[PDB]
Structure formats: structure tokens, C-alpha cells
Design a protein around this nucleic acid. Structure first.
Ligand SMILES: [Zn+2]
Lengths: 87, 143, 129, 94, 193, 81, 150
RNA sequence: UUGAGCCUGGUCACCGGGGUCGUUAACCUUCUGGCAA
RNA sequence: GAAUACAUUAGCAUGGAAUAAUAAAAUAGGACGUGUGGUUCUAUUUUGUUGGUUUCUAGGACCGCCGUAAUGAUUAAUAG
RNA sequence: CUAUGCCGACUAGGGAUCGGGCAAUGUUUCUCGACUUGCUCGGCACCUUACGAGAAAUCAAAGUCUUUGGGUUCC
């Protein structure tokens, strides 16, 4: 949020989940974020370059973390032939 | 209600200040337009009843409030009971409730009134302890 | 018997949002539902929705993008004047800047802020935030 | 189906007559193809009707049900003792 | 030649109905079932329409009551009309009269029949414009911005000779009504219903 | 799950569903044309016919009304359209 | 939910999205009308005849071809029954139950079923009286229920 | 009776409002003034 | 300077037609109309001021037709 | 008595069970039946879990309620 001066005033801006778009609480210990690096031809992944996904504790407890991660990787192009929108 | 002979009382029923003579065949029939847009019915224009307590061919005048209701009891001579339905607002619950009140009105023979027969009436001075209205328009349920 | 399809539509939407599903199916469909969905979609709470047109009342498939805490109906539809909007906002809305109250005023179905700009009251349909 | 049904089909489009005097007239004329007799009929009348229909080559059916039930199935407020159908019409009673 | 020019229409445009009538008479000159079916034939008016490309379409307003003959006639006459209309698409639409919605000031006791409703005539127009491949599906998508696009799922059978006509169908529909209509055919794999 | 194409369901999924629970409800029956084993005529019969259909030519019972689909007994070939 | 039962059955018929006759079914919209009139001349039920055209004749939903309902077609042609089909069938069932009750005097279950049928027939009669499909004075009679059915 | 294309004078590129043009019929209609096919 | 608002419960009036209610033309017993023929009345008028009939005339109302037109019945609710 | 009003919508995983229907170039039986498997509708229920509720015991309803409003009786 911003005041009249236009400067963002708050303790922090909580990270929104990448699957269901929900706020991750400060004590949401079930929520985790995973990182997958970028690989070129013949392995030898490039250091310093990676894409991260945050999965909320509610999703992980419900058991939808695997499917949500599969969907996110398919959208970002890091995974193929495992997640189908048609179902 | 039912068209009977106009001389059905102990006295002679005649329109006041209406005269018959020889130079002119009998006399004339007097009528007035109650105003406010209501048209005098053709039966009243060419009829035979007297009905001193009638907005047409009579002496009572229509003035005051104009109301509309539904006939609930037409079991009296030249007089019927109508029912007015309205919703009363109770502020505490912010809701409404059904409220009804019965109104007694006088009816001319020019109108045939049964149950239903949404009638529009107008105030025409007290008639007998309850009747301050006269029927001016009829919305028939059959026509 | 179904008394109000708008209540069923909003209850299905809020249930799906709580469950975390990104799509929801509403049956049947009506102009009031379409107008309500348009209002929240214009305000940004609802993604694209498609109306399946069978030879019946119809069906709606709505894409849910989160960012909805609760959407509900206000039954019976109380008549709301201009001065009653503030009371309804205080009673239902979380604050004076967050949330929308939908009123079916004389000029159509729209938000409480837009109706206040129109300077016309009406009947309260529901709320969403 | 049932005789009550078939009687229901024949009453819309068909030629039928009611009572005992009329059914005797139709049998004597010879145009009566079908006769129906109530259960609680006088046995002498039943024998006479059977004899008349045998001579006139008309079909005889003494179906279950009293004259009250027969009349109710016939569509009448009264009691019917014997039916004489001279033309079924569009049904397949015969 | 030998009348049968003005009798086939009501009013007189510059050239459209005149050439339609003369082409009609020339086609009706063939004997047997051709003349038998084309004897009770009437046309009212024709309008030009443009598509995204250089192709031009002509949409003619048939009178409603005699669509029974057209239901079996326009199936075969379409190709002949296409070749004889100087490389222009031909559309058979029915001219229907609508009635205004009764406002509070405007008290009308004549009533609006459901068959003359704008929604009803719009659906009838959509059915009549794509005469073959009867409608099987209809969807109405509304994006976040608020634009409404309607998708019409047609019948898989008789897909030919209409797969290059639905673009003109959409152009005509958007011209006369304004809806963003997109026609689409399904892909029925395997067998079954 | 949590991402389902409700607008375009799977063809197999629609088949393994009730006739009403589909996205668009519709009939599952079909009208077929039957020829008598010893004749040349055609007859249109319903899959879930409730009454016995009688052929106008020399033929036996065309179908037997069961609880669901009508039983076919004689050696006839049917076309579905 | 069921009107007079605890069941929640949903069995019904799903009409097709198409509103047109089949390609081969050249019913010509007038031979079917003649067939309906012939099927009504005998006096069969409008629902029963519609079944016959669906099964034996092979005709689709009659509205898709003729453009009018079975009840509407026969009413236009004049072969209109004095009472509605559902009204007549319920009166028939009520009459049969009362005839069974007057014989079997110890059937309280059948008496309860008769009461349910009497409630159903009265509600249907009230609706038909309001809609105007019947004369306004259509007071159902228990003693003359035999008259009403036939 | 809904969609689209308009302009317009107006304060915060928006908004409120006024309407035909026509698609789709343009203020349904009653009476009047001049115009009268 | 000695303001302004609170007013609407109930009543009068202007504007809007979203929401929710009764009817529109089914035995067409319907907009039908410088309308194919007629009835019946009033004189709002002139025929000499008053009274009376005719009816050109201005008008209310009514009797068999006349096709002006696309003539009229919402889908048929995983309601009944 | 289910110490738990009625109607309507939504809400998770499994396996049994009654009635009906659909399919099986599956087994079996002197034209159909018996067995098995899959799908669906309508019931009686059971096990796990608790997103959710409660004061807790517990509850697929006693959930969708301080984020409080689908309709309606009794108390
Ligand atoms: Zn056979």
C-alpha cells in the first residue's frame, strides 16, 4: 500500500502462491519453494540461472503440489508430455 | 342489481326539479358529468332509475380522494363492500406485512357488480354512517 | 425447489475458491448472474467466463484467478437508498476501500460506488471481495 | 388390452346402444355385431339375450362386473344391463 | 423476354433484383422438375456485403412463408448461383419484422409474439444463413476486457461447399447484427453417437 | 484437478457419464432401419421402443420391449443414421 | 423431490439439441397429422399415440416435424377431450381405489393412498381452473367421481 | 431491445448526460398548427 | 444578519424501467379502416328572437363482409 | 431415536451392498439364466482424512456462519 507521498509503507509484501494465487503467511511452515536450474546440451547446467516456484502449505497438505508443479513446469517449458489440460 | 320497476317504494320516485307538460312531450332527463375524466355511462344517459344517491342523474358530487379496490360483498341494495390490499412497512425488521381494510361504497344501476370487478370509487360525502364513496369506474373480470 | 439461482452461483464460486480450483461450473444461468459476473470481472475479481447455450436455461464456466475472499448474496433484496449505502458498506464490506456491493438500481445492475455516482438507489443484490 | 379399454375406444367413434329393449331391437334388426351382458343380470334375460344373439350371429360376452360397474365403465351415471355395439368404429373389439 | 421480370419482385432497385430476376427466368427456362419447383418462386431484395478479402457476397431477403420449396431447392441451386453471379457469394436470408419493446409511456395491447422477438429472429437468421450443417453447439465467451465473442459449432456432416462460406456468413452476421461470430466444425473421432 | 477443461471435456469422459450429467444433455438412443429376412421393405424402429412393432409384410415380431433396449431376434441388419 | 414420496429419482428424457427431422424421415408434415388424427379418432391417449409414432412409425419428436404438440394438433382439429389427460388419469386411479376401498373395509394403507390421490387431483384441478382450461365451476365430486372419469 | 458505429457541449485521458442517423422501428400513440401526396 | 438540514412514516407530483408482481389476440370473442353498404342520437350551427320533425353538416355508438400482414401457442428446468 | 424438521445447490479418497440400465468376438447353462469385470442413476450403510465445524465427545453433515442473509414451519 502507498500513502499520499506515494512511497510503499508496510513491513513487507508477502509472496503469492504460484498455483492458487494465495498469500503465504509468516508461519506457513508447510509451504515450500523449489528451484530448477536451466540445462544446456549435454548436461552441464548453467550456474546462476534458475526458475523458482512457491507452493503454499494448503496445496501441499491437500496433495495438489505434484500436479501444480507439473502444470507450472509445462507452462514454463521445462517439462513435456506429463500434464494435459484436456481431462 | 336486478332491473325492477322504478316505483318500488311507498312514495313516488322522481327527479327533483324535473317537470312534464303538454307543449313538450312529457319532460327531459337530467344528467351531469362527474368530472376528473370519468365519462357518464350510456345506461345512465338513457335509463329509468332515480337513485338520488348517485354521482350521475342525482345530486351528490364527487370530490376528495379517488380510490380503487376489489368487491368482497355485494349483498346489499345499491351498496357494496370493497377490500383494499396494501403492504405496511415495519421499520424494525425492514420488511412489509399484508394489511387490508374494508370500504363501503354506493353503486349506481348503470354498473353491474359481482365478486371481483375491480371498482374505482371517489369520495362523494357521507351517505349512511359508512358510505362516503361512489363507484365511478368498473374493470370487469369477464369483458 | 431452487429459490434464487444467484445464491447458488455465488455459493459455488466461493466454494471453488476456498477449494483452490481454478475453474467453476454454474447451472443454471440468468441475466442477473451475467450482470453480476460482468461487474466483478470489470472490477478484476473474475477472469473470462463462457456461457454454454443449450436448449435450456444455460450453463456458465468461469475461470477463477483467486483474489476473492468471499462473494455472497443478500436475501431478501432490501431496497437501498442513497444514505443506506454507507450503512451497508460498514456492515458487509471489510473497509471503505476494499469490497464491492452490487445494487440493481433503476439504471441497471452495477456496483455501489457507480450507483452512488449515478445518484440512484435500488435493491441490494450481493457483495464480493 | 381390456374390455373396459375397448369400450373406451368405441365410445368416441362407434355405434352402441344401451338397455334391454334397445339391444333386442338391434338384435332383431341384425346390425348388432356385439352384445355385452352385466354380471348381475337376470338369468332369464341372459338366456334370452344369448338366444337372440345366437340367432342373429352376434358375439356374446358376459364379462366380470355388476351392472353398476358396467355402467361406470360405459360412461353413465345409471346402471346398464346389456350393451349392443352395432359398429366398433376404429377399435378391434370384434 | 415474355414478362416474368417484374412479377418476381416487389420494388425496383438499380440492377440487383433486375439481374436476379433475369437469372431466375433463365434458370427456370429448363423444363421438368426445375420449372416445377421454380414456378412458385418469389424474391424481395438483395444487399451487398464485404469480407476481409476481396470476395463480395450478396444477401437476398426471401419472403418467409415459401421457405418449404427453398429447403429442397437451394441445396442444388447454390452452385449454379455462385457461378452465374460473377464470382460472388450468395446468401439466403429471411426478412423478418421486429416489434419495439413496450415502454411505460408506449402502451401497446397488440403484444409482441415470441416468434417476432429480436432474439428469436436473430437465432432464426443464424440458422438460415448457414442452412446446411444444422447447429449443434453454441458458446458465448466474454474476456476480461468485456468483449463478447460467440462460437457456433456446426455439424461435421456436409462440411464441404460451406467451409469457404462461413467467413462470408460471419461477415454478413456482423454487418446486420454486430455480434462477433466465429463458426467452427468438430472432429468426431472413432465411431458411436 | 485444480485445472480442468470444463468447456471441452474428454470424449472418453463424456461417454462414461450419465446422459444428463454431460456438459450438454442429449439422447443416447438411435433410430435404425430394419429389413425383413424374407422381404424387401424397410421399417424404422426405436432402440427403447415400448410397444411391439408389426411389419406390414410377411414377418414375425420385429422387436421385444425389454426394460432398456428392445431385443432383436430375427436375422436382420440395421443401419444407424 | 417427489411430490408424495421420499424418493429423489431423476429419470427423464433428454431432448436433442437439434430441432429438425432426420434426413431420411420425409414425414412431409401432413401424413403425420393425418396419422395423429386417425390415432385420436379411436380415442387413444395423446401420450400413448406419441409413443406409437416414436416406436412403430419411427417418427421423431412430433413437434420437430409438425411444428405443433400432440395436444395442440388435436385441439386445433377439434378432437379435444373434455378433460386433460393427467386430470382424467388421476380421476381413474382415484375411482379405482375408492371402488377397492368400498369392498375392502380394512385397508388403511389404501385409504391413505386414496387421500394422497385426492390431494393431488384437487391441486391439479385448482391449477386447471386458474389457467382456464376448464369451466370455472369444476368442483370435484367424490360420489360422482365415476361421472368425471366416465 | 440487444450489439456495434457517432458526435456533442461539460468537471474530476475517464466519467455523467442527449439523442436520432440505421442495421432492427425510430419517440408507440390521442388532439392541434401550418405543409398537403 | 436573524441561515441550512433533519421532512418521505402516510398523502400529491416529476423522471428511470434494473429487480418483483396481474392482464395483452386461442372456440380470434384482436391494431384491423380519408373503408366496400346502412342505422341511431346530440345539436356544438345557419334557415326570422322563442318551441317542434327532416337531415346536407361536426361528432359519440352499432350492424354480414371486405386480406391491409409473416396473422397468433417461449425452450420444455439433472422442477413437477 | 438417526435424542439430529422439510425442499434446493456445492464440497474428498476407497472398498463392499440392494434395485434398474448400458457394454463384454470374458467363463459357464439343459436363449436365456448363473458368475466376473467396467460405467451410470436411485437407496441402506462402512473405513480413512479433516480443507471445514464444534466446548469437546464427534460430524460428508452437526461443513459452505464475526468472511454472520437460498426458501419455510415447530420450539
Ligand atoms: Zn416383423
Amino acid at each position: 500500500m502507498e500513502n499520499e507521498a506515494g512511497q510503499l509503507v508496510d513491513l513487507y509484501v508477502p509472496r503469492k502462491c504460484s498455483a492458487t494465487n494465495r498469500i503465504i503467511q509468516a508461519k506457513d511452515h508447510a509451504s515450500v519453494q523449489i528451484n530448477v536450474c536451466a540445462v544446456d546440451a549435454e548436461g552441464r547446467q548453467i550456474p546462476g540461472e534458475k526458475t523458482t516456484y512457491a507452493i503454499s502449505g494448503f496445496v501441499r497438505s491437500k496433495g495438489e503440489s505434484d500436479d501444480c508443479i507439473n502444470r507450472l513446469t509445462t507452462q514454463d517449458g521445462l517439462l513435456e508430455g506429463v500434464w494435459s489440460y484436456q481431462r | 342489481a336486478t332491473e325492477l320497476v322504478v316505483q318500488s317504494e311507498r312514495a313516488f320516485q322522481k327527479q327533483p326539479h324535473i317537470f312534464q307538460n303538454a307543449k313538450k312531450g312529457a319532460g327531459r332527463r337530467w344528467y351531469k358529468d362527474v368530472g376528473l375524466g370519468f365519462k357518464t355511462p350510456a345506461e345512465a344517459i338513457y335509463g329509468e332509475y332515480v337513485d338520488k344517491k348517485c354521482p350521475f342523474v342525482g345530486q351528490v358530487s364527487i370530490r376528495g380522494r379517488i380510490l380503487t379496490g376489489t368487491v368482497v360483498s355485494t349483498k346489499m341494495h345499491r351498496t357494496i363492500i370493497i377490500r383494499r390490499e396494501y403492504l405496511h412497512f415495519i421499520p424494525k425488521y425492514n420488511r412489509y406485512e399484508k394489511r387490508h381494510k374494508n370500504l363501503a361504497a354506493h353503486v349506481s344501476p348503470a354498473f353491474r357488480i359481482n365478486e371481483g370487478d375491480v371498482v374505482t370509487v371517489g369520495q362523494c360525502r357521507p351517505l349512511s354512517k359508512t358510505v362516503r364513496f361512489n363507484v365511478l369506474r368498473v374493470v370487469k373480470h369477464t369483458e | 425447489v431452487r429459490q434464487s439461482v444467484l445464491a447458488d452461483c455465488l455459493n459455488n464460486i466461493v466454494n471453488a475458491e476456498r477449494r483452490g480450483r481454478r475453474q467453476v461450473l454454474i447451472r443454471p444461468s440468468s441475466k442477473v448472474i451475467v450482470k453480476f459476473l460482468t461487474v466483478m470481472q470489470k472490477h478484476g475479481y473474475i477472469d473470462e467466463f463462457t456461457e454454454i447455450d443449450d436448449h435450456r436455461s444455460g450453463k456458465i464456466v468461469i475461470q477463477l484467478n483467486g483474489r476473492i475472499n468471499k462473494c455472497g448474496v443478500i436475501s431478501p433484496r432490501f431496497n437501498v437508498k442513497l444514505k443506506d449505502i454507507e450503512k451497508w458498506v460498514n456492515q458487509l464490506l471489510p473497509s471503505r476501500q476494499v469490497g464491492v456491493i452490487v445494487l440493481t438500481t433503476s439504471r441497471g445492475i452495477m456496483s455501489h460506488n457507480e450507483a452512488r455516482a449515478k445518484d440512484a438507489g435500488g435493491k441490494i443484490l450481493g457483495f464480493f471481495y | 388390452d381390456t374390455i373396459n379399454a375397448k369400450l373406451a375406444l368405441t365410445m368416441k367413434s362407434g355405434k352402441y346402444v344401451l338397455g334391454y329393449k334397445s339391444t333386442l331391437k338391434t338384435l332383431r334388426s341384425g346390425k348388432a355385431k356385439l352384445i355385452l351382458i352385466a354380471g348381475n343380470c337376470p338369468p332369464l334375460r341372459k338366456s334370452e339375450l344369448e338366444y337372440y344373439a345366437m340367432l342373429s350371429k352376434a358375439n356374446v360376452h358376459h364379462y366380470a362386473g355388476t351392472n353398476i360397474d358396467l355402467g361406470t365403465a360405459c360412461g353413465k351415471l345409471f346402471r346398464v344391463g346389456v350393451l349392443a355395439i352395432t359398429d366398433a368404429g376404429d377399435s378391434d373389439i370384434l | 423476354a415474355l414478362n416474368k421480370i417484374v412479377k418476381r419482385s416487389s420494388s425496383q432497385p438499380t440492377e440487383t433484383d433486375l439481374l436476379v430476376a433475369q437469372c431466375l427466368y433463365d434458370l427456370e427456362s429448363s423444363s421438368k422438375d426445375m420449372a416445377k419447383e421454380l414456378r412458385p418462386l418469389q424474391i424481395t431484395s438483395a444487399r451487398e456485403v464485404e469480407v476481409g478479402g476481396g470476395k463480395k457476397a450478396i444477401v437476398v431477403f426471401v419472403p418467409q412463408p415459401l421457405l418449404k420449396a427453398f429447403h429442397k431447392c437451394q441445396a442444388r441451386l447454390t452452385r449454379e448461383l455462385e457461378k452465374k453471379f460473377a464470382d460472388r457469394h450468395v446468401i439466403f436470408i429471411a426478412q423478418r419484422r421486429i416489434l419495439p419493446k413496450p415502454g411505460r409511456k408506449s402502451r401497446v395491447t397488440q403484444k409482441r409474439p415470441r416468434s417476432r422477438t429480436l432474439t428469436a429472429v436473430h437465432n432464426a437468421i443464424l440458422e438460415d444463413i448457414v442452412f446446411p450443417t444444422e447447429i449443434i453447439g453454441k458458446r458465448t465467451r466474454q474476456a476480461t476486457d468485456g468483449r463478447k465473442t460467440i462460437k457456433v459449432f456446426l455439424d461435421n456432416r456436409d462440411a464441404n461447399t460451406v467451409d469457404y462460406k462461413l467467413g462470408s456468413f460471419s461477415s454478413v452476421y456482423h454487418k446486420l447484427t454486430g455480434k462477433n461470430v466465429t463458426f467452427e466444425f468438430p472432429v468426431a473421432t472413432g465411431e458411436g453417437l | 484437478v485444480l485445472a480442468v477443461d470444463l468447456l471441452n471435456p474428454s470424449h472418453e469422459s463424456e461417454m462414461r457419464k450419465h446422459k444428463l450429467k454431460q456438459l450438454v444433455q442429449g439422447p443416447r438412443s438411435f433410430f435404425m432401419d430394419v429389413k425383413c429376412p424374407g422381404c424387401f421393405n424397410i421399417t424404422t424402429v426405436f432402440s427403447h421402443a415400448q410397444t411391439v412393432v408389426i411389419c406390414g409384410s410377411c414377418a414375425s415380431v420385429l422387436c421385444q420391449p425389454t426394460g432398456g433396449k428392445a431385443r432383436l431376434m430375427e436375422g436382420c441388419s440395421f443401419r444407424r443414421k | 423431490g417427489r411430490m408424495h414420496s421420499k424418493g429423489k429419482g431423476i429419470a427423464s428424457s433428454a431432448l436433442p439439441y437439434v430441432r429438425s427431422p432426420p434426413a431420411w424421415c420425409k414425414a412431409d408434415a401432413d401424413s403425420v397429422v393425418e396419422q395423429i388424427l386417425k390415432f385420436s379418432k379411436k380415442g387413444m391417449s395423446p401420450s400413448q399415440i406419441g409413443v406409437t409414432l416414436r416406436d412403430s412409425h419411427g417418427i421423431p419428436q412430433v413437434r420437430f416435424i409438425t411444428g405443433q404438440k400432440i395436444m395442440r394438433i388435436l385441439k386445433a382439429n377439434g378432437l379435444a377431450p373434455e378433460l386433460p389427460e393427467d386430470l382424467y388419469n388421476l380421476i381413474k386411479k382415484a375411482v379405482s381405489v375408492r371402488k377397492h376401498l368400498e369392498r375392502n373395509r380394512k385397508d388403511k394403507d389404501s385409504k391413505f393412498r386414496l387421500i394422497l390421490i385426492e390431494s393431488r387431483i384437487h391441486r391439479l384441478a385448482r391449477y386447471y381452473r386458474k389457467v382456464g382450461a376448464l369451466p370455472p365451476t369444476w368442483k370435484y365430486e367424490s360420489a360422482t367421481a365415476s361421472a368425471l372419469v366416465a
